[PDB]
Design an enzyme around this catalytic site. Structure first.
Site, PDB file in Angstrom:
ATOM      1  N   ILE A  85       0.888  -1.188   0.000  1.00 47.18           N
ATOM      2  CA  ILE A  85       0.000   0.000   0.000  1.00 47.18           C
ATOM      3  C   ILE A  85       0.909   1.215   0.000  1.00 47.18           C
ATOM      4  O   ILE A  85       1.736   1.331   0.919  1.00 47.18           O
ATOM      5  CB  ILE A  85      -0.922  -0.002   1.229  1.00 47.18           C
ATOM      6  CG1 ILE A  85      -1.629  -1.348   1.444  1.00 47.18           C
ATOM      7  CG2 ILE A  85      -1.909   1.154   1.140  1.00 47.18           C
ATOM      8  CD1 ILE A  85      -1.600  -1.851   2.881  1.00 47.18           C
ATOM      9  N   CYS A  86       0.727   2.096  -0.971  1.00 49.76           N
ATOM     10  CA  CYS A  86       1.395   3.417  -1.003  1.00 49.76           C
ATOM     11  C   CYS A  86       0.502   4.395  -0.232  1.00 49.76           C
ATOM     12  O   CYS A  86      -0.457   4.930  -0.826  1.00 49.76           O
ATOM     13  CB  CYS A  86       1.697   3.851  -2.432  1.00 49.76           C
ATOM     14  SG  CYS A  86       3.182   4.884  -2.548  1.00 49.76           S
ATOM     15  N   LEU A  87       0.775   4.552   1.065  1.00 44.79           N
ATOM     16  CA  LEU A  87      -0.009   5.416   1.985  1.00 44.79           C
ATOM     17  C   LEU A  87       0.873   5.910   3.143  1.00 44.79           C
ATOM     18  O   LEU A  87       1.444   5.048   3.878  1.00 44.79           O
ATOM     19  CB  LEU A  87      -1.206   4.607   2.488  1.00 44.79           C
ATOM     20  CG  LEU A  87      -2.260   5.403   3.254  1.00 44.79           C
ATOM     21  CD1 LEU A  87      -2.746   6.609   2.457  1.00 44.79           C
ATOM     22  CD2 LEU A  87      -3.415   4.488   3.623  1.00 44.79           C
TER      23      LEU A  87
END
Lengths: 153, 543, 316
Positions: A85-87
């Site tokens: 997850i790119c977060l």
């Protein structure tokens, strides 16, 4: 030790009053690990999907963010097939935004929210992000089929 | 300033290896240095990048990888630049940084990094040289994951053997106004072999070959790190002839001084530094045939050194190798030659001057140079001193060489004896033996003698060269040598009388600086300075 | 059609590829953009081909090198491509930018000025080239007016034009790496100082830091006169509003501390500060000093060299 108290409160708060469409329980197979589930969002290609997650709380938690993977393959601009997850809230600052003010519940909420509204500026799958940007229909179709292939039963 | 910087840096190195965790809080301040690399010399840069890099690639502090990305940033940015000064920093940083991160995707990271620095650094000749120098330094100093060294060695070997190494066919390619042959072979090798070197056609195609010697050093050191000092892959390379002009005469081509002179001087300079790097390579090998080839290479070096110093006269503007200096003089005019002696003594003087008052010698302690030279000068250079005394007691070129040999011999003796480690007591064992060999140059048997007796016998041996001295500089060196021995012990009169003798000779010229030093040697050490000055000022008038 | 340029490069230079340029002719957008969307590792290799393939010795290599540049500036910007590819592709566009003739780089820099007027500079990773090009213009001392004069008027046009309020700081972090004169650094920073006014406060401190590290090879009088005249105005307006405090106190402070860590390494910074804050005649002291100037001095008293000097001034 901040681990023990955080886990005790968050576990039981998530077992009795979780956020809606989200579950998080002490992994039966791994009672140091967590199992998380996101239910397929209404009015999304992820509709009719149960997305399993492995939720590991680092030993320095809550001073460090959880390490969470999708076990369910997902077709997403900002999430690769392997579930990464790119977060920002899963990384320490100045880049990330993690603090003990936030928690497992509010970050699983930020995740379900991103699943609703992908942010193309942090792309893990450049192909999926450009298809999301230019060809919404193809993305929605491939992602909904993805939901019915991977997030079904 | 530089020692403060150095000491601080050493302190930081000490503190990070001691307690990383504490400085990792404040490593941020250390990251904030990188704006002011404007006031740090290259060497300090190496240690600086080391520290930051050992901070970041300490294994718990990879969560705080911000350092790692920010220095990656300044690496590529600084590395990029057109201006050599900036390119320089990034070059060195990258190399050293790469070194420490490498102690499978890490191998791909150093691969990408080293390939891009090699690719960027290809275009500038100075920078290409620097990469190879710095990469060699890195591979030698650091024991780092042999997979990466196995990767780089197969690159460097292949790139060297295609870049410079050509066939030993007797005709080279190129329209040259010079008799271009394959010169300075050993001729004990098989002359009809494959391995030769395209030096002069590369130098003419320039007008890559200035980086030749350090590139060979790099290749060898990949090979030395892989096969643990087994040089059986290379030892066909000191067998090679080298594609050169007929350099041996620099007297047939006199009074036609063109860009040809710049070409020839630079050509001999590269050839000798090439040969120096071959001796640096194959010095560690004990095999007798190899040592014979190295001796032959020294004779090739030394004759071309005489041609180069003579070419600079006409056109105006390791230490274990001196185990070969055990070879005695074969003086060509009266009957190791004279040019052999001038080159080896010029080499040992140019080393000792820099070292005791250059990276390979500087990584050795000054005490290591002094200890080894005591065996490696005195009892075989006193032989060469005696042969020089014999020659000068009794055509023009060998006199001019052996005057300069004699100057250099006394200069190396002065460098040895003026060492500031002999007031210190641990080195007095060396001094008792040193004077015991200079006292034992005339007659032996008097052992375990008092220090003053050894001093008096040593100076009594060194003083009676005064009649044979051909030039003013050797005279001044002899009096400064007698002064630095006699200060260990009365002898003011000796130094005054000798200075007076050398001021009273004809000297067929004399530079003002040498004569200044000899007049301050006479007048300070004379019995009465006033009557000495009235002697010179009652002769200053009848001039 | 990607494995018919790998072969071409695998053998020899400017023989088949300089012609392979003139054959295709279509557009290096489909060959990068759509090729990147699938696998960018190709693009990192590909560019090694075109560049070796299009050597600047010929003008039909040079205008093929001037277009591929105008493309890959615009694709990295507008494109949500990965960081990892961008860290390579820019790497190339830097590594190769060294050996150009004069009138192409002024046009690339005019594209850059046009982008700082309008273009969505969503990452100023695009402007990482803008440092080295003003270097490579200056090294070519040949009349295209010489290279350094073109550089001067170019950085005057950067200063005269409007700055992207978002990444004004990131632009000012670029003149850090170029060698400049006094006039040049002065022009660029007095504009970066005009920009404090039209910002949020919390980003003024890091901008001040990146001004000071520039001012290390530039104007110090100016940097600290700007910070002082600005906060002097600020505090007077806070006073007559009282006749945004709980954070105005964080800024003044963080700044004094950020100027401390600099006067610490830059002993001349301190001396210029002190000269600026002399009484001398008492009429300069009734326009100079402040409620902010003095917190700053009375932090400064912690520097070992500087304690004493400072106090003596204040007292007298």
């Amino acid at each position: 030790m901040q681990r023990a108290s955080r886990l005790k409160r968050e576990l039981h708060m998530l077992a009795t009053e979780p956020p809606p469409g989200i579950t998080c329980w002490q992994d039966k197979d791994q009672m140091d690990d967590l199992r998380a589930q996101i239910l397929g969002g209404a009015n999304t290609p992820y509709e009719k999907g149960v997305f399993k997650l492995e939720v590991i709380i680092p030993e320095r938690y809550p001073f460090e963010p959880p390490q969470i993977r999708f076990l369910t393959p997902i077709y997403h601009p900002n999430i690769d097939s392997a579930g990464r997850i790119c977060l920002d809230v899963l990384k320490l600052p100045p880049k990330g935004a993690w603090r003990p003010s936030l928690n497992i519940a509010t970050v699983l909420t930020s995740i379900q929210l991103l699943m609703s509204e992908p942010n193309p500026d942090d792309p893990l799958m450049a192909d999926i992000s450009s298809e999301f940007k230019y060809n919404k229909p193809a993305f929605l179709k491939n992602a909904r089929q993805w939901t019915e292939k991977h997030a079904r039963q | 300033n530089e020692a403060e910087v150095d000491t601080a840096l050493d302190v930081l190195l000490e503190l990070v290896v001691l307690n990383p965790s504490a400085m990792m809080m404040n490593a941020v301040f250390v990251k904030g240095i990188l704006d002011y690399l404007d006031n740090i010399s290259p060497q300090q840069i190496r240690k600086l990048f080391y520290v930051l890099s050992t901070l970041a690639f300490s294994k718990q502090n990879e969560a705080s990888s911000h350092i790692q990305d920010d220095m990656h940033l300044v690496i590529r940015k600084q590395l990029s630049s057109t201006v050599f000064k900036y390119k320089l920093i990034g070059i060195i940083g990258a190399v050293t940084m790469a070194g420490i991160m490498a102690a499978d995707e890490q191998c791909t990271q150093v691969t990408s990094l080293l390939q891009l620095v090699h690719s960027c650094s290809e275009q500038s000749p100075q920078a290409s040289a620097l990469y190879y120098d710095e990469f060699a330094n890195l591979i030698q100093h650091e024991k780092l994951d042999p997979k990466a060294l196995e990767w780089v060695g197969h690159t460097i070997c292949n790139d060297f053997q295609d870049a410079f190494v050509v066939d030993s066919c007797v005709v080279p390619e190129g329209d040259f106004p010079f008799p271009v042959k394959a010169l300075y072979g050993l001729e004990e090798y098989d002359t009809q072999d494959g391995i030769a070197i395209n030096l002069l056609p590369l130098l003419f195609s320039q007008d890559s070959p200035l980086c030749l010697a350090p590139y060979f050093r790099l290749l060898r050191l990949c090979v030395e790190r892989q096969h643990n000092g087994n040089l059986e892959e290379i030892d066909g390379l000191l067998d090679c002839p080298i594609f050169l002009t007929d350099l041996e005469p620099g007297e047939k081509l006199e009074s036609m001084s063109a860009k040809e002179r710049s070409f020839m001087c630079s050509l001999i300079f590269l050839t000798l530094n090439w040969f120096r790097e071959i001796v640096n390579a194959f010095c560690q090998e004990t095999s007798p045939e190899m040592k014979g080839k190295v001796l032959t290479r020294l004779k090739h070096i030394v004759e071309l050194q005489i041609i180069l110093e003579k070419y600079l006269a006409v056109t105006p503007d390791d230490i274990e190798v001196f185990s070969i200096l055990h070879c005695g003089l074969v003086t060509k005019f009266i009957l190791l030659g004279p040019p052999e002696l001038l080159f080896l003594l010029e080499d040992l003087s140019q080393k000792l001057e820099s070292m005791l008052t250059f990276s390979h010698l500087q990584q050795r302690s000054a005490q290591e140079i002094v200890h080894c030279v005591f065996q490696l000068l005195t009892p075989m250079c006193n032989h060469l001193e005696n042969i020089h005394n014999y020659f000068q007691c009794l055509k023009v070129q060998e006199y001019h060489i052996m005057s300069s040999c004699y100057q250099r011999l006394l200069q190396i003796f002065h460098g040895l004896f003026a060492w500031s480690g002999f007031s210190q007591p641990e080195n007095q064992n060396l001094l008792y033996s040193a004077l015991h060999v200079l006292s034992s140059r005339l007659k032996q048997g008097e052992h375990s003698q008092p220090l003053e007796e050894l001093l008096s016998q040593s100076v009594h041996y060194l003083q009676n060269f005064h009649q044979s001295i051909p030039s003013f500089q050797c005279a001044l060196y002899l009096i400064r040598l007698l002064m630095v021995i006699l200060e260990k012990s009365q002898n003011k009169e000796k130094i005054a009388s000798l200075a007076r003798q050398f001021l009273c000779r004809v000297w067929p010229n004399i530079s003002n600086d040498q004569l200044h030093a000899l007049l301050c040697i006479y007048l300070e050490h004379t019995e009465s300075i006033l009557k000495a000055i009235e002697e010179i000022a009652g002769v200053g008038v009848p001039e | 059609m990607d494995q018919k340029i790998l072969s071409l490069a695998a053998e020899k230079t400017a023989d088949k590829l300089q012609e392979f340029l003139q054959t295709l002719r279509e557009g290096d957008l489909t060959n990068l953009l759509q090729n990147q969307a699938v696998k960018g590792k190709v693009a990192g290799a590909l560019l090694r081909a075109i560049f070796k393939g299009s050597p600047c010795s010929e003008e039909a290599g040079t205008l093929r090198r001037r277009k591929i540049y105008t493309c890959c500036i615009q694709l990295v910007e507008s494109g949500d491509l990965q960081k990892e590819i961008v860290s390579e592709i820019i790497g190339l566009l830097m590594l190769e930018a060294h050996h150009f003739p004069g009138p192409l780089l002024v046009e690339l820099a005019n594209e850059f000025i046009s982008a700082v007027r309008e273009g969505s500079l969503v990452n100023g990773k695009s402007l990482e080239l803008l440092p080295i090009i003003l270097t490579a213009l200056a090294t070519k001392k040949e009349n295209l007016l010489s290279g350094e004069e073109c550089k001067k008027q170019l950085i005057n046009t950067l200063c005269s034009g409007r700055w992207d309020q978002q990444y004004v700081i990131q632009l000012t972090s670029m003149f850090k790496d170029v060698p400049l004169t006094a006039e040049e650094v002065e022009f660029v920073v007095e504009k970066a100082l005009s920009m404090f006014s039209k910002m949020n406060l919390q980003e003024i401190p890091p901008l001040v830091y990146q001004l000071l590290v520039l001012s290390s090879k530039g104007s110090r009088k100016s940097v600290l006169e700007g910070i002082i005249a600005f906060f002097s105005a600020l505090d007077k307006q806070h006073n007559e509003e009282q006749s945004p405090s709980g954070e105005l106190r964080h800024v003044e402070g963080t700044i004094i501390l950020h100027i401390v860590f600099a006067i610490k390494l830059d002993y001349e910074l301190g001396r210029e500060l002190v000269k600026h804050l002399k009484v001398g005649q008492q009429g300069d002291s009734n326009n100079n000093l402040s409620p902010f100037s003095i917190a700053l001095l009375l932090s400064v008293t912690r520097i070992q060299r500087f304690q004493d000097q400072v106090l003596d001034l204040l007292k007298t």
